[PDB]
Amino acid sequence: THYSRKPQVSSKSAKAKVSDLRCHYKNTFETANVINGMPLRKAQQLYRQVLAKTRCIPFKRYNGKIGRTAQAKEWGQTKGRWPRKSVVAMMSLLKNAEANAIEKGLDPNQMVIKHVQVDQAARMRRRTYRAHGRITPYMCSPCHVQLFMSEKKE
Amino acid sequence: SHCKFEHPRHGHLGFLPRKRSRQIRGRARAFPKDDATQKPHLTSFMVFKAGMTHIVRDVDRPGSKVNKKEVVEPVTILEAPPMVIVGIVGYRQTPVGLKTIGTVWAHHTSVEFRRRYYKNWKQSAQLAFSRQKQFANTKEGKVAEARTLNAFAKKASVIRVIAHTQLRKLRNHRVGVKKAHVQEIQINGGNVAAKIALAKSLLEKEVRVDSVFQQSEACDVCSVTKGHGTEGVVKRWGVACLPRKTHRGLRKVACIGAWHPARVMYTVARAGQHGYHHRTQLNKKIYQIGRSVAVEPNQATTTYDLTAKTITPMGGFVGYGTVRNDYVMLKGSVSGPRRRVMTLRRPMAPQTSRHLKEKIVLKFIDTSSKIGHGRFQTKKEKNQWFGPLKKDRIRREERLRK
Amino acid sequence: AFPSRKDASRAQRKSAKKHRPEIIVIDLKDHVLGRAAAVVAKQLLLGKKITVVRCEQLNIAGTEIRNKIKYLQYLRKRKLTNPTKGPFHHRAPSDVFVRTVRSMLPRYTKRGMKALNSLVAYEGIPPNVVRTGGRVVIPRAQRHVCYRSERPYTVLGNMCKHVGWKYSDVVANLEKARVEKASRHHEKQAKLREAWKAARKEALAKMPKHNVEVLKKFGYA
RNA sequence: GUUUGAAAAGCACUUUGGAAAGAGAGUGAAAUAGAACCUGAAGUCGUGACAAAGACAAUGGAAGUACCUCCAUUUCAACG
RNA sequence: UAAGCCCAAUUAGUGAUUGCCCAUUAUUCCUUUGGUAAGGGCGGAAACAAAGGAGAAAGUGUAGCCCUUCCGAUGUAGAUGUGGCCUGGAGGUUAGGACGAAGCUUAUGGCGUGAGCCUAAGAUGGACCGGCCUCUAGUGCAGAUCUUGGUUGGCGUAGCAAAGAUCUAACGGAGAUAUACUCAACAUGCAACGUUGGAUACUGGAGCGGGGAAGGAUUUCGUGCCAACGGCACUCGU
RNA sequence: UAAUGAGAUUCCCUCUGUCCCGAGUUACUAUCUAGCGAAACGACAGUCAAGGGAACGGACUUGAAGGGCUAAGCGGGGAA
RNA sequence: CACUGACAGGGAACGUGAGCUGGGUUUAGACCGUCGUGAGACAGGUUGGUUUUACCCUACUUAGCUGGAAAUUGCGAGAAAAAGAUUAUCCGUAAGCGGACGUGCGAGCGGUGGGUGUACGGUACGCUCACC
Ligand SMILES: NC[C@@H]1O[C@H](O[C@H]2[C@@H](O)[C@H](O[C@@H]3[C@@H](O)[C@H](N)C[C@H](N)[C@H]3O[C@H]3O[C@H](CO)[C@@H](O)[C@H](O)[C@H]3N)O[C@@H]2CO)[C@H](N)[C@@H](O)[C@@H]1O
Ligand SMILES: [Mg+2]
Ligand SMILES: [Mg+2]
Ligand SMILES: [Mg+2]
Ligand SMILES: [Mg+2]
């Protein structure tokens, strides 16, 4: 009940989805929106390069006083980061989507990532202890990621 | 209510904005006023800063308490390889300003000149000035050279030439740049027909620093200040530091303004960029235009001091190396660190005061070490204090053993 | 503003003839500064494209010392907190006139910005304006009908050179060189101007006489 | 409120993952009824497609226009 | 040679009127609404099929009984009127619903001055409910430092800075040494976990030593195990 | 009134960064990244000069500015 | 008191406390004097007496990125410009006047090719490919 969009040709498109990821929403937002037009192998290349800290993830919406870096001129930004926990959870999802392409009978080297959508999951409640006897919230904010990818060849 | 006591305000307010220089090099924002009764001559020259030292000279100043007595003056050494002319621009007066008519080029440009057009020269096609080189000697391009040379003679009031520092004769290991520094030098003197003939004659020919300046004159030094990062208000503006028992801090300006005008003013001192600023610094008296070591093995030798020694100190200029080329030696300091390109420009101040007409003869140039305390003037003097040491008596033992 | 390659290829795909819009060029020698500015501020706002020329020759009534002080009282104004955000004090006669027009426009709407960018306001007569048609004049603002001739007046090029405006002598050598050039062009064609009028007197009696006493009834002989 | 459904028929099995899960299949009228599971609001958010737009903070009124419209109504021939 | 001051004109010694620009004013023309409102018509005149038309109620108030005429119209606090609107239930009547009721949704128009009502479409819902006349009341929200639940900007921000400190190799572990080609490796899998060995430190016998009271009451121990917790982490754990 | 005083005061000696007049170094922060992640506050918002006004305007009148979006500061305003 | 050329007078919410300081006013403790029957009073003296928050908007200071003249669009055409502005080679001035490759083969101004010395190390100057 979850996919906002459906593929054109569903017999040439493999889906993948995360139930409740427990990464930060505001970092898996930009980790995942950067691969929304990329092929599967160029999107996987980007994530192995964010881990090596050779390329960065551009923070374009939930940036808000992050440090500005020299590597965000690739994306036309000034500030971006290397969110390694949102990166490696998106690598588990690209590996699920290409396993779901092989059992459909499809070549995973021809898959363009159509449709990345990240939405907010239900938050999880903890507690921090402030001065003067106060107790105030310490929420988690996890996320929902979904993607298909449609084959574009010849 | 008025301020209870008066001090003069902190910092000159005319050097605002105290932001980083747009470019690392010294650039003249104004050349001297063109006297058309003079002979055509260049007006600026780029030199690179190579440490500093001090001299001894006797003073001709009648009336003074130091008349015919020897002073010690600090001097700065500025290495000057010759610059090669590659272009001629010409500017025409408009009610908007001063518009460029065009530029002729030299028919032969250096590798390090057309290196300035590349962020990456070695990994490139390197084909800049390659279609201008071949069009310039076609039939139509020899016309178009003479077409815009005539348009200088019609419309131009200001003729300038384009030179570049020629860094491969600067055999310096620490100035790491290999592309040449490019500026425009204004011709002053004569009419426009007499300026272009001097601009045509020294084209694709190197101009040497002693053809622009004389030995005992002054000059302006357009140069970019040594940079110091973000500094607070006490380092940058020189405000007074607050009493010791102040909460949240000392090195601050206490009041940044009244209730009304309900805004902070541009006159209130704040923190930010200190250093790396362009400065012009007029009336820098020149003391010695030096000559290259291939010509002069005895550079710091005076009439009154016959020690055979060069300008480079013992153990080199600290952080720089060796002065391998021609050099100018100026009285005092110039803005900037060592290795930085600086523009010696002819003065706009009246050079008629009796301090500035004074001819300079030296008596001593300090060639002692700038590492540590300088003690010996040459290495011949350290081999006479210290005799044969241990490492010399075992090198003399290998030389007998052969 | 030179036209881009998108604006240049479309003038080659479509074979665009060289176009000039209907531009009225006023010669403002010996005009009242604010009477000419109000005629111009109404015409620009009625959709006229207006080039204004010779702004160093505009006149303001009163002693030159009087009008120079009124500019220096205007230059006394600046935003004390940050003068880079302050009133910007333009010293050119061509820019004094653009301001005086602009202060008579609805400056803070788009209709008054479309009318202030319809004004150009050169000073002297530039080479692109010279041979583009006869200059016009504003005869209700011309100082010989608007100022009493015993009263002093003030040339705007002289008030402005002593408050700034470092290009007074440049304009004076660009307009000395024009009137020398345009008077050499006018001694030429004097045997072309006299050639036509000795052919328009010769066209009479070579044309039929029943079209001449209708050409003499309406006084066109 | 446990009120999933008429009935657990409460998703066998396949292959990706260490797993949570995912992609298919299957049950059922319905699975966008999949387990504190009928309906699923407002606020808030993501995404696809578009409309644009300087700095007059925005909203607002009047009067036109430009483009759009799973909307209404009327008209189609010796007739509106 | 005012676009200033004081006088004066109205297109100028030409022959007579009122230069023209702007109102929620004035005059007048429409429409609405209310009157201390004012008049008229309401005994169906005759006649008329399909293949000139419909209405006409003796009336406070309506989708007003129908026409004609005249005057007024803003307003806080306040009073009043309303065949004025809306919600829950009750008495009666008249009807809807598995061919889809309530609810929800809206670039769904329609019409009412308005409160509101009604239609359409849901690729929504899945069993109840509308209209009119009366009766009744826990009957209408935008604000009470309003109550309760949720959400949001701030914001991936402030911060997670006392108690010195960790390093190494081998094993364990899913936690790696993770790459579409025409690529030797660096420049495309980073970080992080436990155990033993080794190195380096620390506590320094008023001890991050070994036992008791009070207090706690299974935290003890082994084995599995990682959802949530141990504000970072965990394969470890009170 | 001797002795005693974390009592109140004054001078002198020694002494020194209290000061003239500041400079330079260290550890920890700030700062940048990985993981984690709040609060106060919040009508709407936020450039000024003068005028008027409930007689100190971010909004009204007439002028003067203002391309958009950012990172680190900072304490003049927001009668914070 | 002393130096100085001189030690002018004021404003900015009696400028300026999330700038500081806290001496003083301006609490609770205590002492004294005068007052009051008392509790207490005192523009009387004395002593001791928590100075909290910026990470928001603007302003100012510096530090980045980046469009746009219909100030995002219109295709809405304005050059501080050349002079066929009616066809078309330049040079130099208006009257004049200098020359301009000729027909796949040639030539000319030229960019790069092989061997024995010149100007202030290595770049230029002597003697196969494009264009006219
Ligand atoms: N997008 C604009 C907004 O639409 C909202 O309302 C929208 C939704 O509430 C509404 O819901 C749609 C419905 O149209 C559509 N025909 C079917 C769909 N099931 C509904 O969507 C609903 O269900 C899905 C999952 O089933 C949820 O994820 C979703 O949050 C929920 N809105 O569609 C409405 C638009 O037609 C708000 N009323 C309004 O504030 C605003 O206009
Ligand atoms: Mg440095
Ligand atoms: Mg009322
Ligand atoms: Mg109630
Ligand atoms: Mg820390």
Ligand SMILES: [Mg+2]
């Ligand atoms: Mg120890």
Ligand SMILES: [Mg+2]
């Ligand atoms: Mg934890």
Ligand SMILES: [Mg+2]
């Ligand atoms: Mg005691």
